[PDB]
Design a protein around this ligand. Structure first.
Ligand code: A1CKN
Length: 134
């Protein structure tokens, strides 16, 4: 047993707050905000050795990343940014930093009760996205 066992599984979005304002802060355009904001993604997290895989499946886009903690990688996001990402574990929280065009956003993922809580921050603006087991 290991590092991220409590994150492993299949999760479904059950609530979102302030995601439009977060997307505006990130620079997402109108049409993508409207369509992406409707989505109710499935997030599938798995671990094989040191490699963590996070898939997001939705009517808008299917994305997948695989990574080793602390080791930077290339990521094309669902809103089509080309970013440099680093994911670390900090006190039981998965901390995902995305860098592009001199900008930065941080996505934190933690277990709280039976939920997996996703907090997305872009400057002063936070969005909170709550997932439960599928
Ligand atoms: C449609 C859809 C697909 C995937 C997600 S991942 C997100 C966390 C990661 C957020 C930062 S990357 C990003 C993704 C989409 C947009 Cl619009 C803007 C930024 C989460 O809900 O858990 C959200 C919405």
């Amino acid at each position: 047993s290991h590092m991220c066992d409590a994150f492993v599984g299949t999760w479904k979005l059950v609530s979102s707050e302030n995601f439009d304002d977060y997307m505006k802060e990130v620079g997402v355009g109108f049409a993508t905000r409207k369509v992406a904001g409707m989505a109710k993604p499935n997030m599938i997290i798995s671990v094989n050795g040191d490699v963590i895989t996070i898939k997001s499946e939705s009517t808008f886009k299917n994305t997948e990343i695989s990574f080793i903690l602390g080791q930077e990688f290339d990521e094309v996001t669902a809103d089509d940014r080309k970013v440099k990402s680093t994911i670390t574990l900090d006190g039981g929280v998965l901390v995902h930093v995305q860098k592009w065009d001199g900008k930065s956003t941080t996505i934190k993922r933690k277990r709280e009760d039976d939920k997996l809580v996703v907090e997305c921050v872009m400057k002063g603006v936070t969005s909170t996205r709550v997932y439960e087991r599928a």
